[PDB]
Write an enzyme that holds these catalytic residues in place. Structure first.
Site, PDB file in Angstrom:
ATOM      1  N   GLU A  92      62.431 -89.878  19.969  1.00  0.00           N
ATOM      2  CA  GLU A  92      61.620 -90.494  18.910  1.00  0.00           C
ATOM      3  C   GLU A  92      62.189 -91.822  18.462  1.00  0.00           C
ATOM      4  O   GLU A  92      61.452 -92.827  18.373  1.00  0.00           O
ATOM      5  CB  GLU A  92      61.400 -89.574  17.699  1.00  0.00           C
ATOM      6  CG  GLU A  92      60.760 -88.246  18.089  1.00  0.00           C
ATOM      7  CD  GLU A  92      59.813 -87.743  17.039  1.00  0.00           C
ATOM      8  OE1 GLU A  92      60.145 -86.773  16.317  1.00  0.00           O
ATOM      9  OE2 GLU A  92      58.736 -88.304  16.940  1.00  0.00           O
ATOM     10  N   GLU A 112      59.190 -80.697  20.534  1.00  0.00           N
ATOM     11  CA  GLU A 112      58.824 -80.041  19.290  1.00  0.00           C
ATOM     12  C   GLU A 112      57.711 -79.021  19.492  1.00  0.00           C
ATOM     13  O   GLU A 112      57.767 -77.942  18.920  1.00  0.00           O
ATOM     14  CB  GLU A 112      58.379 -81.049  18.219  1.00  0.00           C
ATOM     15  CG  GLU A 112      59.520 -81.705  17.452  1.00  0.00           C
ATOM     16  CD  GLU A 112      60.628 -82.181  18.356  1.00  0.00           C
ATOM     17  OE1 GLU A 112      61.770 -81.670  18.234  1.00  0.00           O
ATOM     18  OE2 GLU A 112      60.351 -83.008  19.237  1.00  0.00           O
TER      19      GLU A 112
END
Lengths: 238, 238, 238
Positions: A92, A112
């Site tokens: 990220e 995730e």
């Protein structure tokens, strides 16, 4: 030591995420130090570039998280130097960097969804904008992990180097950036930020307004002189 | 001769930047002739395609610069044929072309920042939209020069050919474009332009409004007929 | 049988375009059945993923065409499994899928312009957004057909497999998606849709509003537990 290490080396600030016994997993202290480092990058005119890396052979309202460069971007170029695992948080924050070096054994992914969590670092916005649409969808929806080679093939990173060399390569790139005209480098970066999501005809108006001041500088005279003389320019950030 | 050469070859206009003793560096005369050529492309219904190239083994308010295709785009497809150096101006104008052929030894780059100049040809807007984000940032902020092979790998050009063959390949592509339905080719191009920066659902409304008239044409009947007969269609631009 | 076949296999719906004597060319019946299938994907909470494929060794106001995923997108991931010819309609509908597997001999292209027709499936909007700008322009304006290898190189598809294996590979991907948290998978997909065409700072506000509810779920607790226990999570879509 501190959960993020910070060193100024000439015109480059080097920020190292530093919890190597926890794969440089983010802590409150790490994030606090990172935000202080971002402030220093933006506010110190002597800083021309920044490198974000991780220690020990690893890399790493909530709509704005400064430490993770979500809703905030550095005003000077940010180069990532990725060794080893960069899953989840690492992939990220990678998307908030501008220029990207990965060691051969580095691993990327946003997993995730595998655990029914949502990615809080802005990947659901950015990834489809940075690599091809279909590949971005594959990575986000399956949580597939990828190699450095695969990351380079899809355009997620720009450089692959042997293990242990990511920071060395990043420093080489930073030396080049530091040697370029900071007024021009920083103006280009501002246009890239400000013109996102506009038709190009609207964007050109902003591009020109941002760029025109660069030509008024002493640096804009020294640059072409140095080019003609086949020497390194001596820029002063004015 | 004139600082840009202009030739009509059937339905294709060929524009050659022509100051080969100065690496086809832009002049006022070159730009004036280029704008006249753009006008001819847009306004002459017999022109279906355009090629932009450079002579002698080289390629090449200020928010709108027609000659450099910044704030103006041709209404018919524009194919670049790049031999040799295409640094600075050449790489900028390249981004206003649609289809792109590079000879093996061609070199691309936007090195303005190295000399503390700002790129006036719109690269700070376009490049991040045309190649992967991180690579675009690398090129603009470092000023790194790249090979034709590297340019193809990142998607900056679509075709690489041996030295001296770029224009030949471009003419092959132009022959194909010239043989396609000009009403359809030009409608597709207009949708690509008009729908930039919109969510796709808003874009589809414009796409359909632009495209629907194509089906009313005599050409839209001749095309499927020719397909069935396994012959080249004879399109009339109506 | 029916002009589209529909099968539920656990959490995956498989939709097969089924006129193999006509290369799976679209019919009214095919489209009607496809829209019913899209409704089932969106409305049945037991469906976590969808695969679109074609039978027999082939693949395949008017501003909104639900069957062709133009102006409508499925709320769950859609994986394409492409065998053989996918010219025209097939390449258009491909662009409304999220994850994409092509068999070695698959062929892609949008050749409408060759016959002076306009592409009614939304390619003039989407293609430049999914593959590099210049390549998208080349394909749309020339109508050039491409191989699976070429499609992978440019980012139009994500996976290439041997002939006859596209659906098997797609089922493997679907099993992974079906095993991930449906609340997270579907939230990510909604952010990707909703944030198209916005500056990232505006997008992050929507990203966070969409994602926050995922953490309230029973699934968001089971996921990290299963990860720690090195077992497959048992998600319940709540």
């Amino acid at each position: 030591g501190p959960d993020a290490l910070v060193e100024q080396r000439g015109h480059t600030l080097i920020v190292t995420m530093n919890r190597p016994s926890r794969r440089n997993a983010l802590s409150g202290e790490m994030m606090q130090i990172m935000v202080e480092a971002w402030d220093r990058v933006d506010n110190d005119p002597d800083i021309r570039c920044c490198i974000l890396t991780g220690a020990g052979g690893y890399f790493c309202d909530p709509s704005r998280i400064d430490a993770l460069l979500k809703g905030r971007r550095l005003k000077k170029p940010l180069i990532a130097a990725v060794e080893g695992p960069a899953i989840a948080g690492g992939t990220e924050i990678l998307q908030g960097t501008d220029i990207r070096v990965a060691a051969e054994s580095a691993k990327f992914g946003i997993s995730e969804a595998k655990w029914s969590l949502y990615p809080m670092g802005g990947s659901a916005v950015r990834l489809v904008r940075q690599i091809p649409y279909t590949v971005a969808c594959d990575l986000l929806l399956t949580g597939r992990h990828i190699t450095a080679a695969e990351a380079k093939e899809m355009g997620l990173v720009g450089h692959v180097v042997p293990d242990g060399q990511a920071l060395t390569k990043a420093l080489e790139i930073a030396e080049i950036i530091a040697a370029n005209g900071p007024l021009a480098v920083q103006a280009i970066l501002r246009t890239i930020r400000e013109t996102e999501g506009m038709h190009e005809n609207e964007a050109f108006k902003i591009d020109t307004r941002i760029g025109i001041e660069v030509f008024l500088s002493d640096d804009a005279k020294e640059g072409p002189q140095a080019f003609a003389q086949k020497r390194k320019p001596n820029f002063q950030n004015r």
